[PDB]
């Protein structure tokens, strides 16, 4: 007659609230919408930077710290600075960049229904597990042999990045090389 399954709140070692994942998700879409409806391209990039931050914070809260911090350092810290640099220098009249968005409204609706309906069916059950009574619960336990010397994610990447998959690293270096020589050749006087 006893209740063999027992459920109770965790006091310490608790963990963050999944509610915060919901606020970040709506902040990303609001900032994302503001990117493509903003009049001034500079303000558009500011909303884009905001979008990068929310995705970056999202990644940190689910435990993807190294990749999340890389977005902050690289996309916000380097890529979007380069974008703000060029935009803030070039001569721009907002009247010349503003089209009648109302003429695009039905195509906007149609494209959204068509693309979303097809693309959603492609998502594996893992990503759609917790989005839109009998709520399912994830359960985890410990291992000991698996936890003898844990790597942080950045160390697990470093284990394979230079040895097992180093062809990717060589290829990326060539792209970086080409980007460096190419952007210099087309912009500066010899």
Partner 1 sequence: SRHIELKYPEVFSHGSPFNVPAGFYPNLDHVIEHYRKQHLEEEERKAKKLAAAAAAA
Partner 2 sequence: RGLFRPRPLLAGAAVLMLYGWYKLVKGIREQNELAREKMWARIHLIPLLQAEEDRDHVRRYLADQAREKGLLGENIKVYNSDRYVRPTFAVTPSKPAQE
Partner 3 sequence: TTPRFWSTPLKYCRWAARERPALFFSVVIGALGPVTLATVPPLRRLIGDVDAAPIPLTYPIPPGPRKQLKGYDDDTED
Ligand X SMILES: CCCCCCCCCCCCCCCCCC(=O)OC[C@H](COP(=O)(O)OCCN)OC(=O)CCCCCCCCCCCCCCCCC
Q: Which parts of this chain interact with partner 2 (CB under 8 A)?
A: 3-9, 136-139, 141-145, 148-149
Query: Which residue from 148, 170, 185, 188 is in contact with partner 1, where contact means CB under 8 A?
Result: 148
Quick one: what does residue 3 bind among partner 3, partner 2, partner 1, none, with the CB cut-off 5 to 8 Å set by partner type?
partner 2
Quick one: what does residue 139 bind among partner 1, partner 3, partner 2, none, with the CB cut-off 5 to 8 Å set by partner type?
partner 2
For tokens 């810290």, name the residue. Answer: 77
Q: How far is CA 28 from CA 23, 78, 140, 171, in A?
A: 9, 20, 29, 32
CA within 13 Å, CB half, 142: 4
On the 0-12 / 13-18 / 19+ scale of CB atoms within 10 A, 56 is: buried
**Does residue 98 bind partner 1 (CB under 8 A)?**
no
Query: Which residue from 94, 98, 108, 151 is in contact with partner 1, where contact means CB under 8 A?
Result: 151
- The CA distance from 126 to 77, in Å, is 31
Which stretches of the chain bind partner 1, using CB under 8 A? 143, 145-151, 159, 164
């Amino acid at each position: 007659s006893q209740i063999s399954l027992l459920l109770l709140k965790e006091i310490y070692t608790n963990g963050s609230t999944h509610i915060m994942l919901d606020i970040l998700s709506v902040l990303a879409v609001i900032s994302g919408i503001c990117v493509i409806i903003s009049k001034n391209p500079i303000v558009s990039v500011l909303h884009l930077i905001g979008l990068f931050a929310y995705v970056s914070f999202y990644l940190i809260l689910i435990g993807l710290n190294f990749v999340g911090l890389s977005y902050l350092i690289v996309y916000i810290g380097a890529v979007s600075i380069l974008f703000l640099f060029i935009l803030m220098l070039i001569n721009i009249r907002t009247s010349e960049l503003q089209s009648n968005t109302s003429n695009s409204i039905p195509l906007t609706i149609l494209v959204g229904i068509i693309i979303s309906s097809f693309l959603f069916k492609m998502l594996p059950y893992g990503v759609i597990i917790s989005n839109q009574k009998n709520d399912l619960f994830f359960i985890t336990s410990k291992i000991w042999d698996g936890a003898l010397a844990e790597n942080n994610h950045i160390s697990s990447i470093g284990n394979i990045m230079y040895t097992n998959y180093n062809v990717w690293l060589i290829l990326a270096s060539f792209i970086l090389l080409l980007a460096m020589v190419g952007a210099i050749v087309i912009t500066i006087k010899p």
